[PDB]
Amino acid sequence: XVXXX
C-alpha cells in the first residue's frame, strides 16, 4: 500500500 504493503 499501490506503491508494490
Side-chain angles (χ1 to χ4, degrees):
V2 14

